[PDB]
Amino acid sequence: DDQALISEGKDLYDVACITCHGVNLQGVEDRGPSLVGVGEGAVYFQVHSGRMPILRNEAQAERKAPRYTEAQTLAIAAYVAANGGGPGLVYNEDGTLAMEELRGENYDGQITSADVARGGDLFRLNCASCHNFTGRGGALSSGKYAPNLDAANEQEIYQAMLTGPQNMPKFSDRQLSADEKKDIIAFIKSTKETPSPGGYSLGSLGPVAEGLFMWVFGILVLVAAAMWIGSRS
Amino acid sequence: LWTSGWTLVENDVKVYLGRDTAAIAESHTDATGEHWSTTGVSRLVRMRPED
Amino acid sequence: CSAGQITQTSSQVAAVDGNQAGSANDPVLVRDVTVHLTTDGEAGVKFTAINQDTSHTSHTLESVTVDGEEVELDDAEPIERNCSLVADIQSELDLIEEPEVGCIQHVATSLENPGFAYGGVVPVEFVFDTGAITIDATVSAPVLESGVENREVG
Amino acid sequence: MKSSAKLMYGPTVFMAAMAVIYIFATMHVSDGGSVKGVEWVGSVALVLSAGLTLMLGVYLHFTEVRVDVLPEDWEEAEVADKAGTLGFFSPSSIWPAAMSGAVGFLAFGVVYFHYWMIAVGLMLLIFTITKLNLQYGVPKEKH
Amino acid sequence: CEVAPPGGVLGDFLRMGWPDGITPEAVAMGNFWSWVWVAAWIIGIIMWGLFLTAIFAWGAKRAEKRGEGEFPKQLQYNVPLELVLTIVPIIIVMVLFFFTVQTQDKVTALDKNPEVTVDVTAYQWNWKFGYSEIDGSLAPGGQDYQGSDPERQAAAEASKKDPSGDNPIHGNSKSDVSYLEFNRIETLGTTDEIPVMVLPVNTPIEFNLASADVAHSFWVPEFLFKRDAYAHPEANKSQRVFQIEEITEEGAFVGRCAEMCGTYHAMMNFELRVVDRDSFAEYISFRDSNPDATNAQALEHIGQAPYATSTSPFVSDRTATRDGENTQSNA
Ligand code: HEC
Ligand code: HEC
Numbered sequence: 040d041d042q043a044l045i046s047e048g049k050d051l052y053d054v055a056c057i058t059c060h061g062v063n064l065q066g067v068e069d070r071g072p073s074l075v076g077v078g079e080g081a082v083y084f085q086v087h088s089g090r091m092p093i094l095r096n097e098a099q100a101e102r103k104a105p106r107y108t109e110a111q112t113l114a115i116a117a118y119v120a121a122n123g124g125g126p127g128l129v130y131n132e133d134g135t136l137a138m139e140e141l142r143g144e145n146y147d148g149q150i151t152s153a154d155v156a157r158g159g160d161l162f163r164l165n166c167a168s169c170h171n172f173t174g175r176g177g178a179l180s181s182g183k184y185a186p187n188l189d190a191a192n193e194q195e196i197y198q199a200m201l202t203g204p205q206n207m208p209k210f211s212d213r214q215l216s217a218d219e220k221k222d223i224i225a226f227i228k229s230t231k232e233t234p235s236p237g238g239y240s241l242g243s244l245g246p247v248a249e250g251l252f253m254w255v256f257g258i259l260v261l262v263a264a265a266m267w268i269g270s271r272s
Numbered sequence: 273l274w275t276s277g278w279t280l281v282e283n284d285v286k287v288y289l290g291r292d293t294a295a296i297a298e299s300h301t302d303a304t305g306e307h308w309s310t311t312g313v314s315r316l317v318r319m320r321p322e323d
Numbered sequence: 324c325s326a327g328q329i330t331q332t333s334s335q336v337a338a339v340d341g342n343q344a345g346s347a348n349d350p351v352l353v354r355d356v357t358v359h360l361t362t363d364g365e366a367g368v369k370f371t372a373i374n375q376d377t378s379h380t381s382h383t384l385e386s387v388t389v390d391g392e393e394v395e396l397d398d399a400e401p402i403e404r405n406c407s408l409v410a411d412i413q414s415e416l417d418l419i420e421e422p423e424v425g426c427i428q429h430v431a432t433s434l435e436n437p438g439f440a441y442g443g444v445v446p447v448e449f450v451f452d453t454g455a456i457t458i459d460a461t462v463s464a465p466v467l468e469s470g471v472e473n474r475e476v477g
Numbered sequence: 478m479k480s481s482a483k484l485m486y487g488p489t490v491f492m493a494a495m496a497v498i499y500i501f502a503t504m505h506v507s508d509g510g511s512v513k514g515v516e517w518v519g520s521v522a523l524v525l526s527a528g529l530t531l532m533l534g535v536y537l538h539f540t541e542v543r544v545d546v547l548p549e550d551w552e553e554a555e556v557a558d559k560a561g562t563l564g565f566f567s568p569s570s571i572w573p574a575a576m577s578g579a580v581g582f583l584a585f586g587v588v589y590f591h592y593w594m595i596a597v598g599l600m601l602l603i604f605t606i607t608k609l610n611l612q613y614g615v616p617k618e619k620h
Numbered sequence: 621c622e623v624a625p626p627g628g629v630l631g632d633f634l635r636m637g638w639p640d641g642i643t644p645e646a647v648a649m650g651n652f653w654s655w656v657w658v659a660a661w662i663i664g665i666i667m668w669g670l671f672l673t674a675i676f677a678w679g680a681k682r683a684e685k686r687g688e689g690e691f692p693k694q695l696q697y698n699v700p701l702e703l704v705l706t707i708v709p710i711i712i713v714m715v716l717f718f719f720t721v722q723t724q725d726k727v728t729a730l731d732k733n734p735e736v737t738v739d740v741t742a743y744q745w746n747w748k749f750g751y752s753e754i755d756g757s758l759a760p761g762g763q764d765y766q767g768s769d770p771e772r773q774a775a776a777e778a779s780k781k782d783p784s785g786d787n788p789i790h791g792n793s794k795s796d797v798s799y800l801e802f803n804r805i806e807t808l809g810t811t812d813e814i815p816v817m818v819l820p821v822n823t824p825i826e827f828n829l830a831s832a833d834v835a836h837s838f839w840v841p842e843f844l845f846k847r848d849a850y851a852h853p854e855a856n857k858s859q860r861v862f863q864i865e866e867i868t869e870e871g872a873f874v875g876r877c878a879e880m881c882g883t884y885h886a887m888m889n890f891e892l893r894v895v896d897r898d899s900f901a902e903y904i905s906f907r908d909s910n911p912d913a914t915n916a917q918a919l920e921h922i923g924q925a926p927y928a929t930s931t932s933p934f935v936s937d938r939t940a941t942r943d944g945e946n947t948q949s950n951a
Binding site: 041042045046049062063064065066067068069070072073074075076077078080081093095096097098099100117118120121122123124125126127128129130137141144181182183197201202203204205209211212213216217218219 | 324325326330331332333334335336337338339341343346347352354355369371373375405406407409411415418419420421422423424425427464466467468469470471472473474
C-alpha cells in the first residue's frame with residue numbers, strides 16, 4: 040500500500056518543493072534546508088497546517104490555508120520518509136491518525152482533570168514562556184513570534200513538540216514522554232474549550248487588555264455620563 | 273546572595289541535574305476518608321545524556 | 324528589514340542530530356550524518372550520500388570510519404547522478420520502505436562500540452573512489468516509536 | 478439643467494449596444510486562440526454601467542421637466558437675475574477628519590481582523606457620522 | 621505579412637531590436653511590425669515638425685517685429701478641415717485593423733497538424749517538460765508514440781475528490797491536479813540545472829500549457845510569441861494549446877517567464893534546443909530505451925552540450941551574488 044503511495048508522493052514533490060529542497064532532498068544553498076531524516080511527522084505538521092510552501096523568505100513562516108489535502112500530505116510524507124525516515128506519526132489502535140485520543144494519559148471519553156493539572160504545570164514549565172499562560176502566543180526577537188495554539192489539532196501539537204518547527208526546541212519522546220505530551224494536549228484543549236467563568240475573557244492577554252479597555256472606554260463612558268449630568272459652561 | 277543550591281558541589285556533595293516531572297500529589301480514599309499522599313512520587317528526576 | 328539578503332528563515336538547517344557536508348557546488352554530499360547507539364548497545368552510522376556530480380562520474384562508497392574505527396556495510400551499489408544511498412542501522416532501516424520509483428537504495432550498517440559517549444562528537448571519515456570527505460558527527464540514541472513510551476519512575 | 482440631462486443619453490446607449498454586441502459575440506464566435514462561451518464578468522459590468530448612466534440621465538430629465546427657465550441656462554442672463562440667497566453652506570467642521578480616522582481604525586481592524594477593532598470601529602464610525610449630521614441642530618445649552 | 625521589410629540599415633532601425641525569428645509566423649509578425657513602425661515614424665515626424673514650427677516659426681517676437689500687432693487672426697472654427705482630420709485617423713486605424721486581423725488569425729489558428737506535442741508544466745519556480753505524442757516518423761516504434769504515464773496520471777485523476785471528503789470547489793477537492801499531464805519521458809528543471817526541451821527542425825509542433833501554482837507565462841523571444849499558463853485552464857476558459865507551423869533553423873534559444881509569479885520570478889528560465897530531425901529520433905529512442913538516464917546524458921548521446929548554453933543557473937546564495945558573478949559553472 041505504501042509502495043504505490045510513494046509514487047504520488049514523488050509526483051507531488053517534483054512539482055512544488057524542488058526549488059527549495061532539491062530533487063534529492065539535499066536542500067539548496069540559501070533557499071531551503073535539507074529534508075533528509077525529518078520523517079513523516081515534520082512533513083505532516085508543515086504541510087497539513089499549511090506552513091509549506093513558503094513563497095517569501097521572511098523572519099518566520101506563516102500558517103495559512105493548506106495547499107494540499109490529507110491524502111496528498113500523507114503521500115508526500117511517505118516519499119520523504121523513504122529518504123532516511125525520522126520521527127513518525129502517532130497512529131491510533133486501529134491505524135488512523137490519533138485525534139481526541141491524545142487528550143490525557145487517562146483519557147476515556149472526557150478530559151480527566153488530574154491530567155489537566157499535571158499538563159498545566161508542564162505547560163507552565165516549558166511551553167508557557169514562548170506562548171503565554173493559556174497559549175495565546177507571544178513575541179520573540181527580530182520579527183519572530185510564537186503562534187496562538189487555538190488553531191492546531193492534537194496531531195499537529197504532538198508533531199510540533201516532536202520536531203521543533205523553526206525556533207521551537209525539539210521535545211523528544213524521552214525528554215517529554217508520551218504521557219507528558221498527552222497531558223499537555225489535554226491542558227491545551229481544556230484551556231481552549233472552556234468558557235471563562237468571569238464573563239468575556241478580553242482575549243486572556245493579561246493586564247494589557249484590561250488596562251486598554253478601562254483606561255480608554257470605561258473612563259470615556261463615565262465622562263460622557265458626567266457631561267450628561269453637568270454643564271458645558 | 274553569594275550562594276545557591278549548586279554551592280553544595282563545593283567538594284561536599286554529589287548533585288545531579290534534576291528535571292521537573294511536574295507530578296502532583298496522588299489521592300487515596302477508603303473507609304477512613306480521602307486524603308492526599310506524596311509518599312510514592314518524586315518531582316525531580318535524574319537524566320542520562322541521550323534524552 | 325527581515326526580507327533582506329540576510330534572512331532568518333534562509334539560514335536554517337534541519338532539526339536533526341545529523342551534521343552535513345558539501346555545498347551546492349560540491350560533487351557528492353553527505354546529509355544527516357550521525358552515530359547511532361541504541362540503549363541495547365548496538366551502534367552504527369546513519370547518513371545519506373547524494374551524488375550530484377555534473378560530470379556524471381558515478382561513485383561507489385569504498386569505506387566509512389568513525390575515529391578511524393571501521394563500520395561494517397555491504398551491498399552498496401554505485402551512486403550515479405541524482406541518486407541517494409541511505410545508510411542506517413538495520414533495526415531502524417527496517418522501519419521505512421524502499422521506493423520502487425526513484426533512485427534511492429537502502430543499506431544497513433553496524434559498528435563495534437569502542438566506548439563512545441552519548442552527547443559527545445566524533446569524526447567520521449568517508450572515502451569514495453573519487454576522494455575522501457571528513458565531517459564531525461554527534462552520538463545519540465535512535466528515535467522512539469512516537470507515542471508508545473511513558474515516563475516510568477522505577 | 479437641460480443640456481446635461483440629455484447629453485448622458487449617448488454614453489448609456491453606446492454601452493448598452495456594446496453589451497448586447499459583446500454577449501452575442503462571445504457566445505457565438507469560436508475563434509482560435511480563444512474559447513467559445515458567454516462570459517458573465519464584463520457583460521454584467523457593461524449592462525450595469527449602462528444602468529448607472531441611464532439612472533443619472535432619466536432622473537435628471539424627470540427633474541428637469543419640472544424646473545423653470547433658470548438664469549444660469551438663459552443665454553442672455555444678467556447678473557441681477559440670481560440676486561438673493563444662494564443656499565446654506567457649512568462654514569467649518571471637525572467631523573470629516575474624525576470620521577476619516579474612524580474609517581481608518583475600522584480598516585486597520587479588518588486588516589489584522591481583531592474583532593474588537595471591527596466592533597469599536599463600527600461604533601465609532603456611526604458616532605462620528607451622527608455627530609456630522611446633527612452639527613447645525615444640536616440644542617442650545619439647557620440653562 | 622507576405623511582404624518583407626525594407627531591409628538594410630532602414631530595416632535594422634525599423635526592427636528595432638526584435639529577434640529575427642525562427643518560425644513562419646515569427647516572420648509574419650516581424651514584417652507587420654516593421655511596416656507599422658514605418659507608418660508610426662511618418663506620423664511622429666509629421667507632427668514633431670508642427671511643434672517645431674510653433675517653437676521657431678509662430679513665435680510672438682517674430683510677428684511683433686514683423687508688425688503683426690498684439691493679437692493673431694482669432695480663428696476658431698474650420699469645420700470642413702476638422703471633419704477631414706477626423707476622417708483621416710478613422711481610415712488609418714481601419715486599414716491597420718484589417719492587416720492586424722490577417723496576421724493575428726494566421727498566428728492563432730489551431731490547424732497546423734502537429735507531429736510533436738509537448739505537455740508543459742509551470743510551477744513555482746521552474747519548468748517541467750514532457751513529450752505527450754510523437755508522430756510515427758520520429759517515434760521509436762514506427763507507430764505513433766503516446767507518452768501518458770498510466771499509474772502517475774491515474775493518481776492525478778484520483779486526486780479529484782474524496783480525501784475522506786472536503787470537496788468544496790464545485791464538488792472537487794481544492795487540491796485537484798487532474799488537469800496536469802504526467803508523461804513517462806520528462807525533463808525536470810531544477811535550481812541546479814536549467815531544463816532543456818529538445819525539438820526537431822521543420823515539423824509542426826504543439827505546446828500544451830498548464831500551471832501547478834499561480835499563473836505563469838511561456839515566452840520564447842525567438843518565436844515572437846508568449847502565452848499564459850493557468851491552473852485549471854478549462855475552468856478559466858483559457859486556450860491552453862498553441863501550435864507553431866514549424867521551426868526553421870537549429871540552435872539553442874533562451875525562453876523566460878513573462879508573468880509575475882512570486883519571489884523567484886527572475887530565476888525561472890528555460891532553454892529550447894532545436895536539433896537536426898534525424899538526431900531527434902536518436903534522442904527519443906535513447907530516452908525511451910533507458911529511462912533512468914538524465915537529460916544531459918541524452919544530449920551527450922546526440923553530441924551537443926549536456927547543459928543549457930544559452931543561460932546558466934543563477935547562484936542560489938543571497939550574499940555571494942554581490943560582486944556580479946551570479947552565474948553557476950555548470951561544468
Ligand atoms: C520558544 C523557544 C518556544 C517554546 C519553549 C515552545 N515553542 Fe511552540 N512554537 C514556537 C514557535 C516559534 C512556533 C512557530 C513555529 C512555526 O514554524 O511557525 C511554535 C509553534 C507551536 C505549535 C504550532 C501552533 C500552530 O498554530 O500550528 C504548537 C502546537 C506548539 N508550538 C506547541 C508547543 C508546546 C506544547 C510547547 C511546550 C512543550 C512548546 N510549543 C514550546 C516557539 C516555542
Ligand atoms: C521554497 C519555494 C519552498 C517550497 C516550495 C517548500 N518549502 Fe519546505 N521549507 C522552505 C524553507 C525556506 C524552509 C525553512 C524554514 C522553515 O519554515 O522551517 C523549509 C522547511 C521545511 C521543513 C522543515 C524541516 C525540519 O527539519 O523541520 C519541511 C519538513 C519542509 N520544508 C517540507 C516541505 C515539503 C514536503 C514541501 C513541498 C510539498 C515544501 N516544504 C515546500 C521552503 C520551501
